[PDB]
Design a protein around this ligand. Structure first.
Ligand code: HEM
Ligand SMILES: CC(C)(C(=O)c1cccnc1)c1cccnc1
Length: 455
């Protein structure tokens, strides 16, 4: 048949686009995720409904409901995310753990992310602020446009190794065949490439793949890491890794893989967006570059706290994310039958939350296409609704590495700005771009001219 749930958002009354027999609505994804989420916002109003193959997906918007699913019933009903491809042992990674397994793993690794262990960690990261700048000499010193994610990938990689395991290398070009090479390969998934597009229409295909040990995390890489943490529990007997020292032994390898997975590519992608918004906005760059020099007496190493008080930095961050919430949705699975401010939702239904849309809904933002931080200064800062600006989600299952991500990103900008300036040039294609893949990302990679500030 192929149309199981296709008559749920007529009969229950929710509006929406109308499915084809086996595909449902996936053909809308040629725009990518965002655009379909917008277009439907305009169209079917404040709540709507659609089918990813025959998985029925319900969008929401009113913050009151958002909160009731994202914070409130959160343990009761609405705890797991949607399952995806064959996951194998990464089944026990915290982002993919469900229900009580998740509750266990959460409050356990929470301690690992407490500020404290973070300020304990900043010195390590600072270290790769210098390394990043030294090797950005030889991109400027060679006066040729500069591909940013190439330089920020190595920075993430460098910070990802050290914080996660201890291994302290300058992958940043240079020693680029140790260990860099597995991590280099842990790339975020494109849920619009033909593999997952298949699996969505063919959910029954997943258990099949399960058996053939086919797994969505490249086994080459998982094997390697699984034996690297082997090597180390041992060696050390005579850092997130050590930090984790019931929590299972071979569960630890799942988390630390996931910590790399989430951290590596998102950090370098956001970072290079920021440096896109400080070209053709040298006016923001200035307020910041100056803001910096004032907190950091002409070149001075950033500290944990020098960071937290730089809240024009903190402003450029938040607005950059406003535009580019890398997880263009938060998405939660309805445990069971439940009603949420008069709207009722049946078991097995995906409750979705169009973050990137919301983050441009002319209702909570104005001239909402504009890069302009002053939304995030006090006087604008705290009028806008927490369940609308959700770039790390909200409620128990938010980004457990939020502060860390933010710490580490700022930490990088400071050392960068406080030495350099970033202006357009050839290929710095000024419109903006934006992939029609299922990853939120440029399309053409952002490349800039980088002129040294006296050096
Ligand atoms: C670039 C900055 C980052 C962004 C925007 C981001 C975004 C997110 C979002 C939106 C979620 C889901 C939130 C929700 O369901 O409400 C999430 C979950 C998660 N993030 Fe991040 N993340 C970032 C950096 C990091 C890094 C550095 C780590 C390293 C530990 C990390 C680890 C995780 C984990 C483990 C989860 C799932 C935890 C759970 O589901 O209980 N993230 N992230
Ligand atoms: C993939 C992962 C782990 C994640 O849990 C996630 C990402 C987007 C939406 N929902 C969940 C993630 C990805 C990027 C940053 N943090 C976490």
């Amino acid at each position: 048949y192929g149309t199981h749930s296709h008559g749920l958002f007529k009969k229950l009354g929710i509006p929406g686009p109308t499915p084809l027999p086996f595909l449902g609505n996936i053909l809308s994804y040629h725009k990518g995720f965002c655009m379909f989420d917008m277009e439907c916002h305009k169209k079917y109003g404040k709540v709507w409904g659609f089918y990813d193959g025959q998985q029925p997906v319900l969008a929401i918007t009113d913050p009151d409901m958002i909160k009731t699913v994202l914070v409130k019933e959160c343990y009761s009903v609405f705890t797991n995310r949607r399952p995806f491809g064959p996951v194998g042992f990464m089944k026990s990674a915290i982002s993919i753990a469900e229900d009580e397994e998740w509750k266990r793993l959460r409050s356990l690794l929470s301690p690992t992310f407490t500020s404290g262990k973070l300020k304990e960690m900043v010195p390590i990261i600072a270290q790769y602020g210098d390394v990043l700048v030294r090797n950005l000499r030889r991109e400027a010193e060679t006066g040729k446009p500069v591909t940013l994610k190439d330089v920020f990938g190595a920075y993430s990689m460098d910070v990802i190794t050290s914080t996660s395991f201890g291994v302290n290398i300058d992958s940043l070009n240079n020693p680029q065949d140790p260990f860099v090479e597995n991590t280099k390969k842990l790339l975020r998934f494109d849920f619009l490439d033909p593999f997952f597009l298949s699996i969505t229409v063919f959910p029954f295909l997943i258990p099949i793949l399960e058996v053939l040990n086919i797994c969505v995390f490249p086994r080459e890489v998982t094997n390697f890491l699984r034996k690297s943490v082997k090597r180390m529990k041992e060696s050390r007997l005579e850092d997130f890794l050590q930090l984790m020292i019931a929590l299972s032994d071979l569960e630890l390898v799942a988390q630390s893989i996931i910590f790399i997975f989430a951290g590596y590519e998102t950090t370098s992608s956001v970072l290079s967006f920021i440096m896109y918004e400080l070209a053709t906005h040298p006016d923001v760059q200035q307020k910041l570059q100056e803001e910096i020099d004032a907190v950091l007496p002409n070149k001075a190493p950033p500290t944990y706290d020098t960071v937290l008080q730089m809240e024009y930095l903190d402003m450029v961050v938040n607005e950059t994310l406003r535009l580019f919430p890398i997880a263009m949705r938060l998405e939660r699975v309805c445990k069971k039958d439940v009603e949420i401010n008069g709207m009722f939702i049946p078991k097995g239904v995906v409750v979705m939350i169009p973050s990137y849309a919301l983050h441009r809904d002319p209702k909570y933002w104005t001239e909402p296409e504009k890069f302009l931080p002053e939304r995030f200064s006090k006087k604008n800062k705290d009028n806008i609704d927490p369940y609308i600006y959700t770039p790390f989600g909200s409620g128990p299952r938010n980004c457990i590495g939020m502060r860390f991500a933010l710490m580490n990103m700022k930490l990088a900008l400071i050392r960068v700005l406080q030495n350099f300036s970033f202006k357009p040039c050839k290929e710095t294609q000024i419109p903006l771009k934006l992939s029609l893949g299922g990853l939120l990302q440029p399309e053409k990679p952002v490349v800039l001219k980088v002129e040294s500030r006296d050096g």
